Design a protein around this ligand. Structure first.
Ligand SMILES: NC(=O)C1=CN([C@@H]2O[C@H](COP(=O)(O)OP(=O)(O)OC[C@H]3O[C@@H](n4cnc5c(N)ncnc54)[C@H](OP(=O)(O)O)[C@@H]3O)[C@@H](O)[C@H]2O)C=CC1
Ligand SMILES: NC(=O)C1=CN([C@@H]2O[C@H](COP(=O)(O)OP(=O)(O)OC[C@H]3O[C@@H](n4cnc5c(N)ncnc54)[C@H](OP(=O)(O)O)[C@@H]3O)[C@@H](O)[C@H]2O)C=CC1
Ligand SMILES: O=P(O)(O)OC[C@H]1O[C@@H](O)[C@H](O)[C@@H](O)[C@@H]1O
Lengths: 535, 534
């Protein structure tokens, strides 16, 4: 026959084909030619050794991703899982199963084209993807069928008992890449049929960002999940808590005495946390019309950043005392009122390239949901009294940008106008950076030592995986330091719910602004009145 | 032979990598390379940059450099004046004349080979070198002859009378590039014969160190010059006060609340001011033997840096406000004791390349003179109580650099052994640099959270400092000149220790050249609040 050689030839054609779809229009005639030509010298080769702890290899692990046909598992969950295999963090005998109600004609065509198509670029690393796909299986069934979960458990129990390790049984990790409405039925089916083998093994369930839309809707949803799983088993991922630069916030603050001495109201004059984004709704205005920018990236993302910035020192580095301070600081904030808020809704841009938010057909006529929102929070405690906290977010803005911008009070004496406010910036995207801006005397001889200029002490990028998989590694370790807790969720909703009821009741209206600008100019007038000085 | 030039440029890149920023070396070599191109742009000697104030040109100006044939005026003073002319800072009609006892033949030949030979190595680029020499002149005479000053006054009066401006009279700046013992006679000759013309002008007198060798001998010297000139007219230069990084110490502290909030004993755990030099005495041992390193670079240079670091905030940037705070902070310092000192004296290197300090022919055998000295100072005020202040200076050591190294108190509880002390480093030589060291999470592993690594926040942004001090004296900005009350109080801090080392109560510890110093000195640094480690 022609043994073994077939696997190498098939391992080429699937690699280009995923790039052909991502390359998209136009004609693919040249795309096949030079990409394989680039691989000739790209062709590692040593199998990556397991960096995983010896304790994790003691007994079997199973990873079940519900909604494998869903948009999140395709573009994010599974591609993140492949990234962990390249790092060796997965045990060698790991078993992955994709669960979805959709019928699948043939799994082998499906994994080669529906899942690997979103994989991270594989010109230097594509050969390892073929070995990775052997671990993946697929399981068709309903999310509410206790019978199918009794059928799925029989499949997991075989590989759990086939494991080659001193310990027996199996740990299980479920990833609910599902709409929130489906979450309750799945955990019921897991509790009635998918619980770990009695001989041993733990269970943990990851759930996705949407937790209702107000303080009451989120509270009952967690109440629905209480009977089936406790807080230690639930892992409410936030997209940003796994980010490198924001995990540094707990270290940049407390590990350094210089920052801790000035992290108080006596020195800090203003704090702002912006989430700027140049994209519009991208034709999915109805998917965003029911949300709004406040609950999309402000109640969840910027609030988690504000919690890490304003939290009191944890008693230890244990995950819960860190999260305990994250909740205690959020309880000092009185709920936002409409006087402290400014909304915006992007219109057709002067370029003519971006249709206005109302120009999209999916958006209901007369919509007042905000595409832009700047607001001030007020922390009532001895550390942060009187200090503005300006949260800002918006789509279709002048530039893609998310960063912190603390601004310390300047001491006008002696220098007066020769000096200005110090500020510490912590940027996460487009690129990670941190720097402190200060005034220093100019090198030229000048005179009176008054010829000064602003100067920054840039961190010099002292030294990969996206936060979606970095949190996946934390759930595999059981750390849970970077996952939202339910008490942390209820207080974050309480800050915004009274304001969210007012915008839903029409008491305030968005301010129009055409796309590609900074936003409504009233928002800049609002930021100027809340402690933001600038050069 | 055509290929030889290329090899040298790459070697200077090697030194910067080990010196600082020893992380992600790939990108570091790139940015350091482009900066070297601007180190000399080979700018054409076309226009002259006349940035000097027009009001400085309003009246005739004259500069008198006594000892013009002397070693200091030959290699530094006159070359510095040429750089100020290349910078355009001198008035177009400026007159400078040299004073020395020796008679000279063919004076135009003398400056062309004895003085221009030591001009800055920009002379290949300095097209107007001989044009600058036309302002120079020579004068032979005694330093104590009031008659020679009365004829020197007639020469200056002629050049002052040739000035072409509405203002009358002439301004006069005397540079005493002379041993200090001559200073009492020169100022007496200036007073009785060389004072500025009555119609207008001003007089200013630059004097060089040593400013005595003890508190009383310094007070005798200042009182000897007291009748002839006031403090506003006297300018006691210190070589370091003109350097950019130390002038920035006042700006780094009080212009920024961040440093201002932590510049106190609540946050500062230790302070170190180090002066290291690979160079040995190198055959000139006799002149250093009666001085010693304590009064060579510590009582003057390092003490001036310590005053700028610990001084209370001036009420204003006026020059007198800064010196006033410099004296009050020094008054809180109790004089150094013999227990707070460890002396050293370098010997022949293990390779034998640099001869030992006693191998030099000039040094008397058995000398107790120190080539090395580490000391602790104790400031006693609400801001600096209990914080060690470690001064250090030494010749023929492992490395040539001078830097400040603050160490902030470690925050133990949040991370335990995962973190360490913060540091703020301010180096001036070999190259200017400032950076603050901090602990940050190391990117990579999602868990642990105790995994951290030290990192620096480097600052990111030619008239040499000797020229800047002369320009400060011409402009009347006395901010960078030690005052009389500032000087004698600095002597009182050191003299009781200086009387002990002269009396032999402590003697230098031998140490081989090219090492950090005596091993006893390092444990003394560890025993007085220093604790930086990997
Ligand atoms: N995806 C993205 O780009 C982003 C995601 N998010 C948020 O993360 C969350 C991820 O949700 P996501 O998976 O992307 O949304 P999807 O709507 O794409 O997923 C729906 C999945 O659940 C199944 N499902 C639900 N109800 C039914 C039903 N009656 N009948 C059959 N199938 C049903 C679907 O079919 P089947 O069961 O057959 O598989 C499908 O697989 C979202 O809430 C989103 O707000 C945030 C930022 C970006
Ligand atoms: C620094 O700068 C200052 C002077 O530097 P430097 O040039 O090396 O000093 P020097 O001892 O070398 O004296 C330099 C000039 O002063 C005159 N001179 C030489 N010996 C003596 C002496 N015993 N007494 C008085 N004058 C003398 C000479 O002028 P002339 O030619 O007229 O005789 C000589 O050119 C010092 O304080 C040093 O620490
Ligand atoms: O919120 P966004 O637009 O998805 O950006 C998230 C990503 O932004 C990138 O800059 C980071 O490298 C990733 O760690 C991060 O996941």
């Amino acid at each position: 026959d022609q043994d073994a050689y077939v696997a190498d030839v098939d391992g080429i054609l699937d690699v280009l084909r995923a790039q052909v779809l991502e390359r998209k229009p136009d004609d693919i005639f040249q795309f096949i030619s030079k990409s394989a030509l680039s691989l000739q010298k790209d062709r590692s080769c040593d199998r990556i050794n397991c960096k995983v702890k010896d304790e994790q290899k003691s007994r079997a692990l199973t990873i079940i991703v519900f909604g494998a046909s869903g948009d999140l598992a395709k573009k994010k969950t599974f591609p993140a899982l492949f990234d962990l295999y390249c790092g060796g963090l997965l045990p060698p005998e790991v078993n992955i199963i994709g669960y979805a109600r959709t019928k699948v004609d043939d799994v082998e065509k499906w994994k080669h084209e529906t899942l690997m198509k979103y994989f991270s670029n594989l010109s230097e690393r594509g050969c390892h993807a073929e070995d990775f796909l052997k671990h993946i299986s697929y399981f068709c069934g309903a999310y509410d069928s206790v019978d199918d979960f009794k059928r799925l458990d029989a499949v997991i129990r075989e590989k759990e008992n086939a494991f080659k390790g001193p310990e027996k049984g199996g740990n299980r990790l479920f990833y609910l890449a599902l709409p929130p409405s489906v979450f309750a039925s799945v955990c019921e089916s897991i509790h009635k049929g998918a619980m770990p083998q009695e001989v041993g093994g733990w269970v943990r369930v990851i759930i996705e960002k949407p937790f209702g839309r107000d303080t009451k809707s989120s509270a009952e949803l967690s109440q629905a999940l209480e009977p089936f799983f406790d807080e230690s088993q639930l892992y409410r991922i936030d997209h940003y808590l796994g980010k490198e630069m924001v995990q540094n916030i707990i270290t940049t603050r407390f590990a350094n005495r210089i920052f801790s001495a000035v992290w108080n109201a006596s020195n800090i004059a203003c704090v702002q946390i912006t989430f700027k984004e140049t994209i519009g709704t991208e034709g999915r205005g109805g998917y965003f019309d029911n949300i709004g920018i406040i609950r999309d990236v402000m109640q969840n993302h910027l609030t988690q950043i504000l919690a890490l910035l304003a939290m009191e020192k944890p008693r230890s580095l244990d995950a819960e005392c860190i999260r305990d301070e994250k909740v205690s600081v959020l309880k000092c904030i009185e709920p936002i009122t409409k006087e402290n808020c400014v909304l915006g809704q992007y219109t057709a841009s002067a370029d003519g390239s971006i249709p206005g938010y109302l120009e999209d057909v999916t958006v209901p006529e007369g919509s007042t949901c905000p595409t832009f929102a700047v607001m001030r929070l007020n922390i009532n405690n001895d550390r942060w009294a009187g200090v503005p906290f300006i949260l800002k977010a918006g789509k279709a803005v002048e530039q893609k940008y998310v960063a912190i911008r603390i601004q310390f009070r300047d001491e006008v004496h002696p220098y007066g106008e020769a000096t200005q406010r110090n500020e510490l910036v912590i940027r996460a995207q487009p690129s990670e950076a941190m720097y402190v801006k200060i005034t220093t005397k100019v090198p030229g001889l000048s005179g009176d030592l008054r010829q000064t200029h602003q100067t920054e002490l840039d961190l010099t990028y002292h030294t990969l995986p996206d936060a979606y998989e970095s949190l996946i590694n934390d759930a595999l370790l059981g750390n849970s330091t970077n996952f939202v807790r339910k008490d942390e969720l209820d207080v974050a909703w309480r800050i915004f719910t009274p304001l969210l009821h007012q915008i839903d009741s029409g008491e305030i209206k968005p301010i129009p602004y055409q796309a590609g600008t900074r936003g409504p100019k009233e928002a800049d007038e609002f930021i100027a009145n809340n402690g933001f000085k600038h050069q």
